[PDB]
Amino acid sequence: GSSGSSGANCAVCDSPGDLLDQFFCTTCGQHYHGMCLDIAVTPLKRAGWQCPECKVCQNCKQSGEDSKMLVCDTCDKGYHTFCLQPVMKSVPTNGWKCKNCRICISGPSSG
Ligand SMILES: [Zn+2]
Ligand SMILES: [Zn+2]
Ligand SMILES: [Zn+2]
Ligand SMILES: [Zn+2]
């Protein structure tokens, strides 16, 4: 008479809380509440979400310069300032976007 299905709890607060509410990494397989990581739950982030512990630079693919790593607010992808085109000599205050996101609505929009 025991479920015993407790695991992969929040690596920030260490609590099961809500599973759906919090995202689930694919690499490590951890969970993190939107508040614990101060992330904005979006219909895009959910799909293909990656924790800040596994997420790497899709440009150079080298985990280390986390500090100099910009994190979009939509796609939630990590990109090193120097690994940006153009490059981000410096880091913005708040509200950053990537090229893959800024992509405007252009093309034959189908159903
Ligand atoms: Zn948490
Ligand atoms: Zn992870
Ligand atoms: Zn890089
Ligand atoms: Zn983006």
Swiss-Prot record:
Highly expressed in testis and ovary, followed by brain and liver. Also expressed in placenta, peripherical blood, fetal thymus, heart, lung and kidney. Within brain, expression was highest in hippocampus, caudate nucleus, and substantia nigra. Not detected in skeletal muscle and fetal liver. It is found in: Nucleus. A zinc finger (PHD-type) spans 8-57, 54-104. A zinc finger (RING-type) spans 10-55. Histone methyltransferase that catalyzes methyl group transfer from S-adenosyl-L-methionine to the epsilon-amino group of 'Lys-4' of histone H3 (H3K4). Part of chromatin remodeling machinery predominantly forms H3K4me1 methylation marks at active chromatin sites where transcription and DNA repair take place. Likely plays a redundant role with KMT2D in enriching H3K4me1 mark on primed and active enhancer elements. Found in a critical region of chromosome 7, which is commonly deleted in malignant myeloid disorders. Partial duplication of the KMT2C gene are found in the juxtacentromeric region of chromosomes 1, 2, 13 and 21. Juxtacentromeric reshuffling of the KMT2C gene has generated the BAGE genes. The SET domain interacts with histone H3 but not H2A, H2B and H4, and may have a H3 lysine specific methylation activity. Belongs to the class V-like SAM-binding methyltransferase superfamily. Histone-lysine methyltransferase family. TRX/MLL subfamily. It is linked to Kleefstra syndrome 2: A form of Kleefstra syndrome, an autosomal dominant disease characterized by variable intellectual disability, psychomotor developmental delay, seizures, behavioral abnormalities, and facial dysmorphisms. Component of the MLL3 complex (also named ASCOM complex), at least composed of catalytic subunit KMT2C/MLL3, ASH2L, RBBP5, WDR5, NCOA6, DPY30, KDM6A, PAXIP1/PTIP, PAGR1 and alpha- and beta-tubulin. Forms a core complex with the evolutionary conserved subcomplex WRAD composed of WDR5, RBBP5, ASH2L/ASH2 and DPY30 subunits; WRAD differentially stimulates the methyltransferase activity. Interacts (via WIN motif) with WDR5. This is Histone-lysine N-methyltransferase 2C. It comes from Homo sapiens. The lineage of its organism: Eukaryota, Metazoa, Chordata, Craniata, Vertebrata. The gene is KMT2C.
